[PDB]
């Protein structure tokens, strides 16, 4: 476990913690971006210093009872069973009862709360209760908060005890190259894998600055990069020919495996056989849905209703796509449905079951939160080429009828 490019943050945190018997800030609010070592540096630092601490994830604790019982039980394993508290007032009393053990009575007990922003959507008394816990309990306790959101949004309307907000600044390009090039594969040189990370960050940095995603793409594409050296095509020294090979393959990888249209395992299994590009369709380009006949006509009538202004109905059957769909009543859907289909249609119960069945899937959406049964309002939620493919299937020309 190594901490690189984070000397200043570790210095500030270690100095704020102080000696063991001394007090510290009632709460600290660490914030930053998606992969800035918020969890890594805090867990590594607290573990190496050997301070007692309780690491709690808020996304797992979706109830007051679970969060409070989890904190209490992880503190009770550190003393020298299954205490249950259902209110925060019980938690303050039980926390004053647990920390009186001789291991924890002098030191500073830390409670780290990862993913603190979900704590915003729990009970109202919880977050100012944790910000003031050292005052409420009088027990030398510090409560860290690790989050991605700025402190401005966290403030309750009345106000609260202010935490010392600490910022973990992002890795720049040199910092990213120092992080990624540390755990080089031992078979090849360190300089070889450093040049590989240089050609990766040349083409992927403008899109992505996330450390995890860049590391995963540096793991996937590496065997393809050292393909010329194993087949005697080019030596280890000549970086230019290797970069000329790896640039088109990485530009292909940006479009497909980066967006996860091609899965990682399938991408490896294609790349070992030299068959990666254009062989798999991916999760997209499968926009083909096998529909019944009147479902096709109801769906293209709903699309043709929802992207036309109501004034033009007589001009066609008998402000653009940019704004989006516009809701329409049931009556206009039925009028366009009868006009658009050549066959005579009776209004059987199965047609109304079809209209609510497309709503049951995500091909339509009911907007009217009023009385739904007398004049429902509907809105079409499918893209243009899906409707153009369906209209190709039933041989109706949807382009001529659209106003735009």
């Amino acid at each position: 476990n190594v901490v690189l490019c984070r000397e200043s943050q570790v210095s500030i945190l270690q100095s704020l913690f102080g000696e063991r018997h001394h007090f510290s800030f009632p709460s600290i609010f660490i914030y930053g971006h998606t992969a800035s070592g918020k969890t890594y540096v805090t867990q590594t630092l607290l573990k190496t210093l050997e301070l007692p601490h309780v690491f709690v994830n808020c996304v797992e604790c979706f109830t007051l009872r679970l969060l409070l019982e989890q904190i209490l039980n992880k503190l009770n394993h550190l003393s020298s069973t299954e205490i249950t508290c259902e209110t925060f007032n019980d938690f303050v009393r039980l926390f004053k009862q647990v920390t009186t053990a001789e291991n924890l009575k002098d030191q500073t007990v830390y409670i780290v709360l990862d993913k603190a922003e979900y704590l915003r959507d729990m009970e109202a008394n919880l977050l100012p209760g944790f910000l003031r816990l050292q005052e409420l309990a009088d027990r030398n306790v510090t409560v860290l908060f690790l989050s991605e959101i700025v402190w401005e949004k966290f403030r309750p309307n009345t106000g609260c005890f202010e935490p010392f907000v600490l910022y973990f600044p992002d890795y720049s390009i040199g910092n990213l190259q120092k992080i990624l090039s540390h755990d080089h594969p031992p078979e090849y040189s360190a300089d070889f894998y450093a040049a590989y990370i240089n050609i990766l960050l040349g083409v992927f940095y403008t899109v992505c600055r996330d450390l995890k995603e860049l590391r995963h793409l540096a793991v996937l594409n590496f065997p393809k990069y050292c393909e010329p050296v194993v087949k005697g095509e080019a030596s280890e020294r000549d970086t230019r020919k290797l970069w000329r090979n790896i640039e088109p393959h990485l530009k292909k990888a940006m479009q497909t495996v980066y967006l996860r249209e091609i899965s990682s395992s399938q991408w490896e299994k294609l790349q070992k056989d030299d068959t990666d590009p254009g062989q798999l369709k991916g999760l997209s380009a499968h926009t083909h849905v096998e529909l019944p006949y009147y479902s096709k006509f109801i769906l293209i009538a709903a699309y043709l209703a929802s992207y036309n202004p109501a004034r033009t109905d007589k001009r066609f059957f008998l402000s653009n796509h940019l704004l989006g769909p516009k809701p329409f009543p049931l009556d206009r859907l039925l009028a366009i449905l009868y006009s658009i289909v050549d066959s005579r249609v009776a209004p059987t119960a199965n047609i109304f079951s079809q209209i609510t069945s497309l709503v049951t899937l995500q091909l339509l959406t009911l907007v009217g939160h009023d009385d739904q049964l007398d004049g429902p309002k509907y809105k079409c939620t499918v893209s243009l080429d899906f409707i153009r493919a369906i209209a190709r299937t039933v041989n109706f020309d949807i382009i001529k009828y659209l106003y735009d």
């Binding site: 959507d121 729990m122 009970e123 109202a124 008394n125 309750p156 309307n157 049931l330 119960a349 109304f352 079951s353 209209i355 609510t356 069945s357 709503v359 049951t360 939160h369 009023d370 009385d371 739904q372 049964l373 007398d374 429902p376």
Partner: protein, 297 residues
Amino acid sequence: DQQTLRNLLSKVSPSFSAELKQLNQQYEKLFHKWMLQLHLGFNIVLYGLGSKRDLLERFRTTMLQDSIHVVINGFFPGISVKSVLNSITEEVLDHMGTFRSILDQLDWIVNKFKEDSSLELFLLIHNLDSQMLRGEKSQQIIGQLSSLHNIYLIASIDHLNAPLMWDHAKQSLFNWLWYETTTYSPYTEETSYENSLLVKQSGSLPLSSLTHVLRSLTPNARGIFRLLIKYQLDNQDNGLSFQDFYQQCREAFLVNSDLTLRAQLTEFRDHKLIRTKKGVEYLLIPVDNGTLTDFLE
């Protein structure tokens, strides 16, 4: 006019008096064929023009004599599926207790009646698509009850767009056989001349209508509605959005998460307590500010 006068002034004599009697005498033939198809797994819906109440009440007195049956009147304004499930629980199974949620009460009433298949029950719903029993939740509850092997259901629908309630999964659950019975009996029982422009309401907006529908609500729901009243009374000097209201409930210690608030709001929408005047959405109460201030005693 007056409602009492109209109920007294119905001394009319319909023109076709014998042919209507002949018409209603033809649907009494089919009852045995309805008793067979209920036993084989099908369920029956009745659609027509008149009032099917008299026909189903002839059915109950003719056929269902030795069997347990529950008669549900959809037309009564104070009804929900909570009342129906409480009725079956307390007065048939006789548990007479308390359940945390209606979904778990459904699971209890479903894991009994499956243990003992000898027990049998009929449902007779006089109007299935009244304003209280519409909705995805209520039809889902009724459909899950109806799809068992021991509970048989026969219903009647009146509205023009009634089959819009059920989709392909709900139609699988109910398993309907559609039988047309077009009587011509007037809806003397079904309709009540309330919210009618032509006739006086004996008080258009009395506070008793608000008080009675707030007696059924849970006390925390009464608090979530009471806060909306207090916010309504100070904009009389010239709509509340969901976000601001969710904040105001959150520091008032009444909701945990926004889903509880939203599900609570659907109950007010069904009871017609709230109407959302969408502009960006907003919440408003139809009861007028003077009468609303006359509610706080």
